[PDB]
Scaffold this active site. Sequence first.
Site, PDB file in Angstrom:
ATOM      1  N   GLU A   8       1.650   0.087  -5.318  1.00 55.57           N
ATOM      2  CA  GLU A   8       1.133   1.680  -5.395  1.00 55.57           C
ATOM      3  C   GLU A   8       2.027   2.358  -5.817  1.00 55.57           C
ATOM      4  OE1 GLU A   8      -2.083   1.821  -2.029  1.00 55.57           O
ATOM      5  OE2 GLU A   8      -2.628   3.108  -4.241  1.00 55.57           O
ATOM      6  N   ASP A  53       0.738  -1.013  -0.211  1.00 56.67           N
ATOM      7  CA  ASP A  53       0.115   0.267   0.051  1.00 56.67           C
ATOM      8  C   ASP A  53       0.778   1.239   0.111  1.00 56.67           C
ATOM      9  OD1 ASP A  53      -2.907   0.829   0.352  1.00 56.67           O
ATOM     10  OD2 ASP A  53      -1.855   1.531   2.181  1.00 56.67           O
TER      11      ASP A  53
END
EC number: 3.2.1.41
Length: 1054
Positions: free
Chosen positions: A677, A648
Amino acid sequence: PQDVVVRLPDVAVPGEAVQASARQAVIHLVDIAGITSSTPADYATKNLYLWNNETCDALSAPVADWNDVSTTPTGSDKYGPYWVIPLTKESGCINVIVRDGTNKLIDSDLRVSFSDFTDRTVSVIAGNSAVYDSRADAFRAAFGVALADAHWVDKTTLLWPGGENKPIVRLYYSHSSKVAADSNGEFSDKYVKLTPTTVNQQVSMRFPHLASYPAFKLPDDVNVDELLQGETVAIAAESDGILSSATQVQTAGVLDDTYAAAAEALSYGAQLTDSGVTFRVWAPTAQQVELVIYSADKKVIASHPMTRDSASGAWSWQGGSDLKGAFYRYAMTVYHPQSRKVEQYEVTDPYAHSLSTNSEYSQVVDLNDSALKPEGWDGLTMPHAQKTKADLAKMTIHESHIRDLSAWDQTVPAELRGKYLALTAQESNMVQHLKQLSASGVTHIELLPVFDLATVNEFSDKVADIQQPFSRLCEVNSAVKSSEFAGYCDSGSTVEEVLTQLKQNDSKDNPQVQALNTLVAQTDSYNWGYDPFHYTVPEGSYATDPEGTARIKEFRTMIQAIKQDLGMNVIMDVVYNHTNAAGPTDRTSVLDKIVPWYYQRLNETTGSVESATCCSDSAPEHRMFAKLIADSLAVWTTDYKIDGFRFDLMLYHPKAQILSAWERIKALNPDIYFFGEGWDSNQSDRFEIASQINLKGTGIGTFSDRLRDAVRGGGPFDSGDALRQNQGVGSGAGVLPNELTTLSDDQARHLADLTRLGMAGNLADFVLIDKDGAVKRGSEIDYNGAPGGYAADPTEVVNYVSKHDNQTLWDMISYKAAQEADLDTRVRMQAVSLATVMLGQGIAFDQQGSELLRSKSFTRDSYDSGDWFNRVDYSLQDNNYNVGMPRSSDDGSNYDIIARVKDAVATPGETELKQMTAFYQELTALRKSSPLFTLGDGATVMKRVDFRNTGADQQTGLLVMTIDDGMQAGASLDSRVDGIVVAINAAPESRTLQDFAGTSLQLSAIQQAAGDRSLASGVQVAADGSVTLPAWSVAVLELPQGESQGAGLPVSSK
Ligand SMILES: OC[C@H]1O[C@@H]2O[C@H]3[C@H](O)[C@@H](O)[C@@H](O[C@H]4[C@H](O)[C@@H](O)[C@@H](O[C@H]5[C@H](O)[C@@H](O)[C@@H](O[C@H]6[C@H](O)[C@@H](O)[C@@H](O[C@H]7[C@H](O)[C@@H](O)[C@@H](O[C@H]1[C@H](O)[C@H]2O)O[C@@H]7CO)O[C@@H]6CO)O[C@@H]5CO)O[C@@H]4CO)O[C@@H]3CO
Ligand SMILES: OC[C@H]1O[C@@H]2O[C@H]3[C@H](O)[C@@H](O)[C@@H](O[C@H]4[C@H](O)[C@@H](O)[C@@H](O[C@H]5[C@H](O)[C@@H](O)[C@@H](O[C@H]6[C@H](O)[C@@H](O)[C@@H](O[C@H]7[C@H](O)[C@@H](O)[C@@H](O[C@H]1[C@H](O)[C@H]2O)O[C@@H]7CO)O[C@@H]6CO)O[C@@H]5CO)O[C@@H]4CO)O[C@@H]3CO
Ligand SMILES: [Ca+2]
Ligand SMILES: [Ca+2]
Ligand SMILES: [Ca+2]
Ligand SMILES: [Ca+2]
Ligand SMILES: [Ca+2]
């Protein structure tokens, strides 16, 4: 010795000059410079500029003429002037700029709010936007500790702006109280003296964002251990010793310079050894660490002062093997800069590997114990290889959540619903469906947070879920009884029954489903869980028993069932970029209680914990948090057998830290896959972030938002009408426009460029023909200004058209589909969208339930929207569409467009769900039907993948990709074909391909076997080799291989 004493100004702390009377406010300007008296200062040119607007209108007689300087002081004393300002009322606020002539002394429009300052008598200082309740407050702000912009970054180097060009620059320190002026207005605490120096080469590498700071040197003989155990304050003073400023000190750099080398060599937590148990915690600034042992029912049964290692700053204690299973906390005595107090509190172990209910106590555990393993655990194998790049490219991910999987499934035994062990219910609808998906080519389950999250109460007595009586909700949630649903407290029906009943008259005007659900959300079992409490313990609420070690064996039993019964690998979502809380008081602040201000990223001026992630930003650039991260991943890898990790907000991590962590994990298991990400965190000034751009070549994967946005339409921040206007390739941009869109043909062809580029792996150097017929490299296709293509290998790219965050694909299609697109056509739009992912070279990623047209009733951000909006019905009755307006706090500005588009067609039922599932499994079977789909290597993609139907006169929406398995490509990687053609006709018109006329192309056998249910139903290959494609179809075609590798489909040199 001979040193001059640093002191406050030799003037008293000021009182107030006047207090405002009725219909009056009073502003003091505290003349800091003239308080250092000398000349009796003249305030004649001081004036206020006062005006009324709509925010602040309480001024009686404002003067809007900026050139009027006549609002001069009402009076003045030795501390400065003051103004008596007439008012029309004593509520509200007034606007003021504080000036000398027409020059602002405070460069900031001032609001003075009578609510914040009830006596309407405030003080301000030149060059300072703060409004103080009293002149004493303002005085102590100027001559007192404030902010924390001093940075002690290694043993002998303090960086601080306040020190530049000042006679006295000193690092004061107090072991046991707050550095403050003594009763003689002097600063009589011990200090180290600092002399100007120049920032060195390795400090500037370490802290680039600080390299422009005025540097200062500490004597080589300073005993850093003694200073770091209390408060340290950097103070600067004039020649006469008068304080110029004083600030708190950030010490993470010197802590790493002093201790990290030694501390990195140690292991942490409660560790079973031969002799017994060794406890070790890192607390280099703590004055005392006491190990507190607790009985099963949480009585202190022993308390052990720990041994401080002076080389590392770690504390350790050794005890008997019988401590296995015991509960424990560390009793800390430690200064916290945020509170400026030597705090005393018990904290759980940041290296905890077992927890009590709700994470209140850590627990001694040996993860190797066979009692904590399901039978056969040690021989559990990875059902899908991840060794080569071609192995990785085959990865096909199904992003799931523990409650989303089973909370609604009546065929899951009641006690396993929303639990890890629901994956063991082999006859359930959910597990059977997952087994079917796996057989068809879903390869990986990715799990939303199953580490210990903070935002579900693991005490079941304190929780009410929608399947339980509404009366239980009222019992546990004291807000419901004063809400408009109070009457249901006595109803005798479940919350689920009430929410269903609320559907009937729910609308943009009466959003009552969402209104009740917002209260349900506060006390239910539901959260995505991006809220880290402990990084290396499983979540307890997903266990049947959250008290102690039981969760460990249930988690492993789940992992075993996924790998061994369902045939899939397992990826964990991990959230090391932030903690749930910081500071010395909050329940879930762990890391920041033990080593205050070390594990959190701080603002360089104020020392506040940053919140750019959402929450309490962490500091993976700091060495002992990097080690915590890596040690944590080692446990998940070795002890829980996790095949890969999705970081994340990976962009908030240093590229070097991520790569470091990865090399650490590959030494344990070489086939472990890292991705995340990787956007722009706004941290590139501190270090090289782990972003899509910077990770090129590294083999670290990133989610690509390029194909995603092209196929879905728009972007995640669209709202209102833009949600409908911004059609994608999947929803007919430029070929089936809706009544609102203005997408031009050029705009639609640009989306097709992004899509084609993504289907070839979104490589920076892949070469294609763009929307204008021009030759472009992947990096030359624009994506909102950035280079579109950015990777070296397709395994570095994760393609998707749906994920847990932002709207589901079906809800996007519903926002965007033209009114004339009927239900069956929208189902084909969903499969066409997913085909771009599933038949592309990038790693394929999808949200759990896309194969069931999953809806969240248009909820954009469903992290705390409960079972109701996140429902996935494995009994296949509907797709959770149209179950009430979404939460107004985040989608209220979309109610208008929702109500306009919501009812265009019928809600999907069992017939549509089964068709979508067949489409989905058809697609995943195609993806694994040939090595050509998953070439893994970027140069190999460049040599084999091409496109037809390109340039300014392309048939809009027709995607035609060819994959060469003929001689010029090199080796025949596929014994049955010389080439593959992928044709995605995202358009309402039937189209004819002539590019392969005369060639013996034929339809893939998989699609022929599906017959009427195929995405390619109705495709015609004529004798001459021309192919007719139905509207909204997907066709995979192949050149059958002969006795030797043929000519195939050579890529053209452009
Ligand atoms: O309706 C007017 C205005 O009302 C509100 O502005 C406040 C403002 O927030 C306060 O700060 C103060 O404004 C002071 C300035 O603080 C002070 O420095 C000086 O401003 C000078 C500017 O620095 C200088 O650039 C120039 O201003 C130009 C400006 O560049 C032009 O863009 C144009 O300004 C227009 C604004 O763009 C427009 O938004 C609106 O301004 C509102 C504002 O939204 C609101 O917050 O209208 C103006 C045009 O009327 O024109 C000026 C031309 O000069 O020059 C000035 C010095 O002349 O002085 C101002 C006050 O005069 O107080 C105002 C309320 O008066
Ligand atoms: O960052 C604060 C943000 O937090 C949450 O957003 C999530 C989001 O749900 C995720 O999708 C992801 O966002 C990624 C995207 O996936 C990725 O594409 C890229 O985003 C780019 C966009 O594609 C592009 O359109 C543009 O966005 C502009 C945007 O048009 C502006 O409106 C403005 O965005 C602001 C939002 O309007 C505002 O709501 C808030 O965003 C929250 C969000 O509510 C929440 O759900 O603040 C932003 C301020 O930036 O500006 C942006 C950019 O200037 O450009 C972007 C950026 O490249 O990257 C993002 C993440 O940066 O993750 C986020 C964060 O967790
Ligand atoms: Ca006051
Ligand atoms: Ca928890
Ligand atoms: Ca909740
Ligand atoms: Ca920053
Ligand atoms: Ca071949």
